[PDB]
Amino acid sequence: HMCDAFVGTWKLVSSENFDDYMKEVGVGFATRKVAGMAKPNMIISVNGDVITIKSESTFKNTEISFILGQEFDEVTADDRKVKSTITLDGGVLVHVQKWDGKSTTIKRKREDDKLVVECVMKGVTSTRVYERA
Ligand SMILES: CO[C@@H](C(=O)O)c1cccc(OCc2ccccc2Cl)c1OCc1ccccc1Cl
């Protein structure tokens, strides 16, 4: 029941500073422009200890499955090959991605009827807000 309030189908409804986040991560111009248009649907499910997060959009479809605290390989939507670990901290899903001596942290939390995603790379934060689909 660890992630019950996250489970479901969610649709992106707002974004702030995502272009700048992507710049900080090292994403190139064309990918930033196209990816920045996307309004993904995020599908979160749990089966035993395994959490699956799918993202479906016009730009790319991604899927990760993981156990909390157990590192895994991830290919991001911008084609980074990262090592990821996702944990729960006080009801917030905390996702750290490491690649090329770089790191980014993505936090997902339930706030009212929304799922709020905060993405941080160095001093740059982006906020992505999802509603139930
Ligand atoms: C599933 O993770 C979602 C979420 O929780 O909002 C999420 C959290 C943090 C960064 C994300 O994309 C980083 C990216 C995406 C595209 C280009 C450059 C970068 Cl740097 C992201 O996926 C967003 C995406 C996922 C799949 C398909 C399209 C999109 Cl636009």
Q: What residues make up the domain containing 40?
A: 8-129
Q: Is residue 85 part of a domain?
A: yes
Q: Under 8 Å CB-to-CB from 67, ≥6 apart: which residues?
A: 49, 50, 51
**Nearest CA to 72 among 43, 97, 109, 91?**
97
Closest protein CA for atom 2 of ligand 1: 55
Q: Is residue 32 part of a domain?
A: yes
Q: Residue 75 and residue 79: Cα distance in Å, rounded?
A: 6
Q: Is residue 1 part of a domain?
A: no
Ligand 1 centre and the CA of 2: distance in Å? 23
Backbone dihedral angles phi then psi of residue 132, each to the nearest 5 degrees: -60, 135
Q: In the chain, how many domains are there?
A: 1
Is residue 1 helix, strand or coil?
coil
Q: Residue 49 and residue 10: Cα distance in Å, rounded?
A: 21
Q: Is residue 55 part of a domain?
A: yes
Q: Is residue 2 part of a domain?
A: no
Q: Residue 5 and residue 10: Cα distance in Å, rounded?
A: 12
Strands 8-16 and 41-47: antiparallel
Within the chain, strands assigned E span 8-16, 41-47, 50-56, 62-66, 72-75, 81-89, 92-99, 102-111, 114-121, 124-132
Q: Where are the alpha helices (DSSP H) in 28-104?
A: 29-37
**Adjacent-strand bridge partners of 15:** 128
Q: Is residue 37 part of a domain?
A: yes
Q: Where are the alpha helices (DSSP H) in the chain?
A: 18-25, 29-37
State the CB neighbour count (10 A cutoff) for residue 44: 20
- Type of residue at 45: S
Is residue 11 helix, strand or coil?
strand
**Burial grade of 53 (CB within 10 A; 0-12, 13-18, 19 or more):** buried
Ligand 1 centre and the CA of 102: distance in Å? 17
3 and 87 Cβ atoms separated by less than 8 Å: no
Closest protein CA for atom 20 of ligand 1: 22
- Residue ranges at the known binding site for a fatty acid: 128-130
Backbone dihedral angles phi then psi of residue 89, each to the nearest 5 degrees: -125, 110
| Expt. technique | X-ray
Q: Is residue 3 part of a domain?
A: no
Q: What is the CATH number of the domain that holds 33?
A: 2.40.128.20
State the CB neighbour count (10 A cutoff) for residue 22: 22
Q: Is residue 76 part of a domain?
A: yes
